[PDB]
Amino acid sequence: PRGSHMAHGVLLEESGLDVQTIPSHDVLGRIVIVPETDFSFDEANETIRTLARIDRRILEQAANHHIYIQLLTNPITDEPIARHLRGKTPRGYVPGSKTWDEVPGIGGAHLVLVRLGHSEKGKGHGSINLELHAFAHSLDYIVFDHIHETDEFQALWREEAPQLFPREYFFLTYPEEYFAESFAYYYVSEKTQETLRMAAPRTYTFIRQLAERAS
Numbered sequence: 001p002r003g004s005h006m007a008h009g010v011l012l013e014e015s016g017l018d019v020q021t022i023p024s025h026d027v028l029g030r031i032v033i034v035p036e037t038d039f040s041f042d043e044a045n046e047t048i049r050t051l052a053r054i055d056r057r058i059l060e061q062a063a064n065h066h067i068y069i070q071l072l073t074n075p076i077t078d079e080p081i082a083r084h085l086r087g088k089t090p091r092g093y094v095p096g097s098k099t100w101d102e103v104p105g106i107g108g109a110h111l112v113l114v115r116l117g118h119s120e121k122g123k124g125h126g127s128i129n130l131e132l133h134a135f136a137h138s139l140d141y142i143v144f145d146h147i148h149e150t151d152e153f154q155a156l157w158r159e160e161a162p163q164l165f166p167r168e169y170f171f172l173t174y175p176e177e178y179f180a181e182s183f184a185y186y187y188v189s190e191k192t193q194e195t196l197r198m199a200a201p202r203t204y205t206f207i208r209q210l211a212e213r214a215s
């Protein structure tokens with residue numbers, strides 16, 4: 001007997017997955033959607049624990065805006081709402097070098113898609129952490145009302161991105177990518193946070209106080 005509340009994925013709080021020792025699991029339980037088919041508990045647990053490093057207030061903002069992060073075992077291009085992407089080149093890549101079938105995450109909308117097993121840099125993407133980076137796009141556009149376009153953030157990007165991402169074209173030259181990757185550096189580990197602080201101290205302070213910038 002399979003309920004329709006699980007047919008298209010399972011909200012984490014309804015999944016039976018044990019997350020009682022994860023910080024902010026009461027909020028993440030209403031944001032994260034896990035697969036309704038077999039999946040790796042280790043991969044989901046690591047992803048959710050990385051998301052749990054985020055300031056609780058920001059997670060509450062995401063939940064109150066009804067942003068969801070759906071963890072997939074399948075490619076994004078098997079989801080009906082992404083099926084038009086099958087076999088197509090993603091913008092910014094040379095055709096033949098990449099297809100959307102190989103892109104493991106998409107952020108920006110109220111539904112963030114993250115394929116499990118692809119978190120680390122180079123696994124189909126160039127971010128230090130796929131789930132933080134993709135979620136940050138949705139935070140940027142929805143919670144923070146395109147904060148990467150503000151005068152203050154634009155000035156931080158101009159002054160500090162050349163110091164932090166001199167060799168990483170997308171993060172250097174796209175303000176929304178600079179925002180999302182700076183967010184990931186702040187939250188993925190103490191080491192990456194201190195790297196951000198040393199190379200881009202005003203950006204570090206901006207991310208640190210991000211929760212006070214919502215709309």
Ligand SMILES: [Zn+2]
Nearest residue numbers: 133137177180
């Ligand atoms: Zn991105």
